[PDB]
Structure 1
Amino acid sequence: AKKVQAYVKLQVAAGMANPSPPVGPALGQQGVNIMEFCKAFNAKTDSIEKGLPIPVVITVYADRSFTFVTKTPPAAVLLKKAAGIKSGSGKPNKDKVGKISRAQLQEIAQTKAADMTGADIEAMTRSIEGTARSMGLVVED
């Protein structure tokens, strides 16, 4: 996309993370509070499975709002959370480690529908294929 400042989506892990890597100079780069936001985040660690990494779209005003906005975990992340591999290949598609069934990918388009331009769920699942192959994880139904 583009790379100099704007709004901050931040790939925050669920559960506590007050210091730097998600909300420190990261989120302190808009001068945003750590506490209540993390409280706002931790309050939302309830529904999202606890400890799960997850991008969040901050609402800010002139005052830089504490409001967070939840996002689905990424499909590739859904795969790494599927096959359970600690480490994706250094040459994905070429290098490989395991594989994953399509039904997972179906569930994936089922949740990633929130992030698809695809005109169909199959196209969505295929954008999930465009990451599925892309991780080096072998694709199967």
Structure 2
Amino acid sequence: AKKVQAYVKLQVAAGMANPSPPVGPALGQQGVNIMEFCKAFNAKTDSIEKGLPIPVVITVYADRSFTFVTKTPPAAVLLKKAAGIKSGSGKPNKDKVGKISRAQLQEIAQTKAADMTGADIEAMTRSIEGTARSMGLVVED
């Protein structure tokens, strides 16, 4: 939290560490490694699950590798398994596509003790309510 000094995010899912197909060559280049992308990967990946996507810091000064404490899996990641489709768009607005509910995704994004906006926690409730409306589902609030 100072300025620009290393940080990116190009992955797929925590249940396959280091992937070469989607991100490939561009995950280790500037004091960052395509091999070491697993040690601090599983410093607490499996400790919870290998079924949720998560990007992370990098932080570099010229040192051998890089230190990058992590945080949340997004809230668009938790609409494939826990709140409907696995495609997402469908036909986003020609027809309502799919539906959800206020209870669904409440706790799934209320757990966020490492991200969110709204001292009032009912606020960052509706401040996750849209990563489901980004695919124009249906309001079963």
Q: Give the shorter-chain TM-score range.
A: 0.7 to 0.9
Rounded to whole Å, the distance in 2 between the matches of 1:88 and 1:3 is: 35
C-alpha deviations, 1:95-133, integer Å up to 9, x for none? Answer: 432222212232134123532222311110111122222
Once the two structures are TM-superposed, the CA of residue 22 in structure 1 deviates from its matched residue by 6.3
CA change 1:42–1:89 in 2 (3 A) is: same
Aligned length in residues: 141
Report the alpha carbon displacement of residue 87 of structure 1 after superposing the two structures with TM: 1.0
CA apart distance, 1:27: 1.5
Shift in Å, 1:71: 2.0
Are the counterparts in 2 of residues 45 and 51 from structure 1 also a CA contact under 8 Å?
no
C-alpha contact (below 8 Å) 1:11/1:55 kept by paired residues:
yes
Contact kept in structure 2, 1:30 and 1:64, CA below 8 Å:
no
Evaluate the alpha carbon distance shift between residue 4 and residue 68 of structure 1 in structure 2; reply closer, same or farther with a 3 A threshold: closer
8 Å contact from structure 2 (residues 17, 38) kept in 1: yes
- In 1: Cα distance, 2:82 partner to 2:54 partner: 16
Looking at secondary structure, tell me which structure has more helix per residue. Answer: 1
* Structure 1 residues 102 and 82: alpha-carbon distance in aligned structure 2, compared to 1, 3 A threshold: same
Alpha-carbon distance change, 4 to 89 in structure 1, aligned in 2, over 3 angstroms: farther
1:23–1:87 distance in 2 versus 1, CA, 3 Å: closer
Contact preservation (8 Å) 1:93, 1:133:
no
**What is the distance in 2 between the residues matched to 1:3 and 1:60?**
12
Q: Deviations over 1:13-37 (max 9, x none)?
A: 2133334356632212324112233
User: Structure 1 length normalisation: TM-score?
Assistant: 0.75
Residues 1:95 and 1:84: Cα distance change in structure 2 (over 3 Å): same
Once the two structures are superposed, residues 41-97 of structure 1 have per-residue CA deviations (whole angstroms, 9 ceiling, x without a partner) of: 134221231142111222323226432322211112212332241211255355432
Q: Is 1:96–2:96 an aligned residue pair?
A: yes
Q: Which runs of 5+ in 2 are unaligned?
A: none
The two structures, once aligned, show a CA RMSD in angstroms of: 3.6
1:70 aligns with 70
